[PDB]
Amino acid sequence: AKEIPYAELLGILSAQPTWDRSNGFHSVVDQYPEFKMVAQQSAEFDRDTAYKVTEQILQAHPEIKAIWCGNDAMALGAMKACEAAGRTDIYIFGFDGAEDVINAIKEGKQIVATIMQFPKLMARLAVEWADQYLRGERSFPEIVPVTVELVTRENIDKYTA
Amino acid sequence: KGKMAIVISTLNNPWFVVLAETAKQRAEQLGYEATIFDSQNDTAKESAHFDAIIAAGYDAIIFNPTDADGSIANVKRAKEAGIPVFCVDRGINARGLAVAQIYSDNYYGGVLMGEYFVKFLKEKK
């Protein structure tokens, strides 16, 4: 494919994670000119809004081969909209590691990747650091990013074991 | 010995349920009592909970703010009360109030997905 058209579902336009995720994605993808983003629209990090937007996108740009979604709720809506149109050929990519996307990936639906967050680890970290603090510790960074991992069809068994 | 308040922005979705029950469980594994306070996406309800939490003499707050601006006043009141605040998942648009603000690396994850986007679709083409 000399050109590969795709669409992007943004999260809520006013929320910074929308743009940290989108700008992270585009910092790589844009250096490959065969990828052409032919549609870009918010679906408000929401499943049912993503269905309605993807539905509009599919009747406007049927030439797309992929849809990148700022979160998994949005990828799930895009999938249900693709299946309703018969567009089972479209590859969908998400972000969060939601159980429903994980199950869709391992069962071979058209969602093929997501980004795993570790919310249990960050909730436990806040508790562990509170404990350390009440025990006397005062040396903590204020801004604490917790890392993430790519989830694919090729490593999905690491995330369902 | 002591108690922590688990102040969650909502419980209307499984993501926040997981955060809340996990923090409560971990606090109890580490020897603390813990209680979950649901703000129901309402900063007024969050503030009322902070009032109760301060009045009850809690030792630390594990905080998932309803609003990065609207919740600053509440962390400010906990600070003035002497109660440390640890933010999880959502943060506040102020520095030097919460002891720590713990969040997921969204930009890094965006970089990882862009790489696989190109690889996967370059193979399939």
Author numbering:
A (entry chain B): 16 to 176
B (entry chain A): 2 to 126
Article passage:
The PBP architecture consists of two opposing lobes, with each lobe being built of a central, five‐stranded parallel β‐sheet with five α‐helices flanking its sides. Despite diversity in the sequences of different PBPs, a shared common ancestry has been proposed a while ago (Fukami‐Kobayashi et al., 1999; Louie, 1993). Their structural features, similarities in binding mechanism, and shared operon structure—with the PBP being on the same operon as the associated signaling proteins downstream—have long led to the theory that PBPs arose via gene duplication of a progenitor protein and subsequent diversification. To further substantiate the claim, we biophysically and structurally characterized truncated constructs of the ribose‐binding protein (RBP) from Thermotoga maritima that correspond to the proposed duplicated progenitor halves. The two independent halves appear to readily form a heterodimer, while also reconstituting the ribose‐binding ability of the parental protein, with affinities in the same order of magnitude.
We therefore decided to continue the investigation with the truncated construct RBP‐Trunc (residues 142–310) instead, which is related to the RBP‐C half and expressed solubly with similar stability to the N‐terminal construct RBP‐N. For this, the individually purified RBP‐N and RBP‐Trunc were mixed in an equimolar ratio and then analyzed. The x‐ray structure of the heterodimer closely resembles the parental protein. The heterodimer displays the same opening and twisting angle as the paternal protein, an important indicator of a native‐like configuration of the heterodimer. The asymmetric unit of the crystal structure shows a dimer of RBP‐N/RBP‐Trunc heterodimers, which is in agreement with the oligomeric state observed in SEC‐MALS experiments; however, further analysis is needed to determine the precise conformation of the dimer of heterodimers in solution. The observed heterodimer interface in the asymmetric unit is mostly related to the interaction of C‐terminal residues of RBP‐Trunc located in the hinge region and their corresponding ones in the crystallography mates, ruling out the possibility that dimerization results from the extra elements left out in RPB‐Trunc. Finally, a closer look at the side‐chains involved in ribose binding reveals an almost identical orientation compared to the unliganded state of the native RBP, suggesting the correct formation of the preformed binding site. The results show that the halves have native‐like properties, that interdomain interactions are important in RBP and that these provide relevant stabilization, in the same way as has been described for other multidomain proteins (Brandts et al., 1989; Careaga et al., 1995; Kantaev et al., 2018; Liu et al., 2019; Vergara et al., 2023; Vogel et al., 2004; Wenk et al., 1998).
